């Protein structure tokens, strides 16, 4: 079989930058190489086929070239909607094989998150569980520390985070941190606080509530 080795694993660049992704075949594949763009949760989309030919309707900022067994995908002027994982594929021999993918992210200026907190709903509390949700909205970069304190006691091992994909227009992220407790434990305590550390904030932001307020 032939393997396709893509580089780098990930690349982050500013809107308007020229971006270069590569793919190397383990042996000759002539020009039988295609490039695909995949947005999270969506089917891959063909950009370039036979190494250098632009598929119909694909913006001209995308181009591909070949030198021996080395293949290059170039985006000449990075747009915010270009964040995706890019894959090369050879069809020279069967099995056709894909590269491992290169994730491209958009670099932009720092933006501090809007921070909000949500107590467990009354409906949920009717059952035996309480979920406390902390929301960080529309921030950059992705890095952030979110800590939970219950009655000033630092919580560990009982929360989970989820993060959105970059906004296609403004390249920001949003993040949720969910604290999960039994109803009984939740009812034992009064002050629920989410503390957020982020580059855009001059010092950490604590968002807090008292149970029953």
């Amino acid at each position: 079989d032939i393997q396709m080795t893509q580089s780098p694993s990930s690349l982050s660049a500013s809107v308007g930058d020229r971006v270069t992704i590569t793919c190397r075949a383990s042996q000759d594949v002539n020009t039988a190489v295609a490039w695909y763009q995949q947005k999270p949760g969506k089917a891959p989309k063909l950009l370039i086929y036979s190494a250098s030919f632009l598929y119909s309707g694909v913006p001209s900022r995308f181009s591909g070239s070949r030198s021996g067994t080395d293949f290059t995908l170039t985006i000449s002027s990075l747009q915010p909607e270009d964040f995706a994982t890019y894959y090369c594929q050879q069809h020279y021999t069967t099995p056709p094989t894909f590269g491992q993918g290169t994730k491209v992210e958009i670099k932009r200026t720092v933006a501090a998150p809007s921070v909000f907190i949500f107590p467990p709903s009354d409906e949920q509390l009717k059952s035996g569980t309480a979920s406390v949700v902390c929301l960080l909205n529309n921030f950059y970069p992705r890095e952030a520390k979110v800590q939970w304190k219950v009655d000033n006691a630092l919580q560990s091992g009982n929360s989970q985070e989820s993060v959105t994909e970059q906004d296609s227009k403004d390249s920001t992220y949003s993040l949720s941190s969910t604290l999960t407790l039994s109803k009984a434990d939740y009812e034992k305590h009064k002050v629920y606080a989410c503390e957020v550390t982020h580059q855009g904030l001059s010092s950490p932001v604590t968002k807090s509530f008292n149970r029953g307020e």
Binding site: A32, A34, Y36, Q38, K42, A43, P44, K45, L46, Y49, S50, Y55, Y87, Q89, H91, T94, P95, P96, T97, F98, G99, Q100, G101, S114, F116, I117, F118, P119, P120, S121, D122, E123, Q124, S127, S131, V133, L135, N137, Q160, E161, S162, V163, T164, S174, S176, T178, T180, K207, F209
Partner: protein, 221 residues
């Protein structure tokens, strides 16, 4: 318009069988190769199998040989993937694609994909709870509110707001696998503070695998 539509994905036990379909329109599969390609959650694209419906020639990835079979019915313009002896590592979104269509030597059209989940765990519909807007979810004249979609299996869940009339400012988070083995996600939306109490906000949650459909009105408490 060329179009491919996969169906038949769902939850199946390890050792079990499933059959996927790929219905094609806007072209004849007799004129192209048809491929199946899969992607395990968080991983890369992996080629699975191909057929040339005109002569029935087939090829397979080594890892599915003998367990999966590809076929095509040209009269129905549909391709199929029978999948037996399923294993956890076969869990993936399965895409059907064409190759050689209009003379383009690449996969120019793909279906939306169909998720296959191989697991001994049982189906479970989600509980949907409000994330009510409050003085703790508002700043600069805009407020956040949402819906917590909790404890379901398997993926996926879809969430829309106001039957898809509300799309601006919506963030539906990727699902997270909880310790319990069940998934959970939130969907939030940011709206004008002044619209609270005058504009109705409803999250529409659909969990097809459990046949769960829930419309949850979210209000200030």
């Amino acid at each position: 318009e060329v179009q491919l539509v996969e169906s038949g994905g769902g939850l199946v036990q390890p050792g079990g069988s499933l059959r996927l379909s790929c219905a094609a329109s806007g072209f004849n599969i007799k004129d192209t190769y048809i491929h199946w390609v899969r992607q395990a959650p968080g991983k890369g694209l992996e080629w699975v199998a191909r057929i040339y419906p005109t002569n029935g020639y087939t090829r397979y990835a080594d890892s599915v040989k003998g367990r999966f079979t590809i076929s095509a019915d040209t009269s129905k313009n549909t391709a199929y993937l029978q999948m037996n002896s399923l294993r956890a590592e076969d869990t993936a979104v399965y895409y059907c694609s064409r190759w050689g269509g209009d003379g383009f030597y690449a996969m120019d059209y793909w279906g939306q994909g169909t998720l296959v989940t191989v697991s001994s765990a049982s189906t479970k519909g989600p509980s949907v709870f409000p994330l009510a807007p409050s003085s703790k979810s508002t700043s600069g004249g805009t407020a956040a509110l949402g819906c917590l979609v909790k404890d379901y299996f398997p993926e996926p869940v879809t969430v829309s707001w106001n039957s898809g009339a509300l799309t601006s400012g919506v963030h539906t988070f990727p699902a997270v696998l909880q310790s319990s083995g069940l998934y959970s996600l939130s969907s939030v939306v940011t709206v004008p503070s002044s619209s609270l109490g005058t504009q109705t906000y409803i999250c529409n949650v659909n969990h097809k695998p459990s046949n769960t459909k829930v419309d949850k009105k979210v209000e200030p408490k």
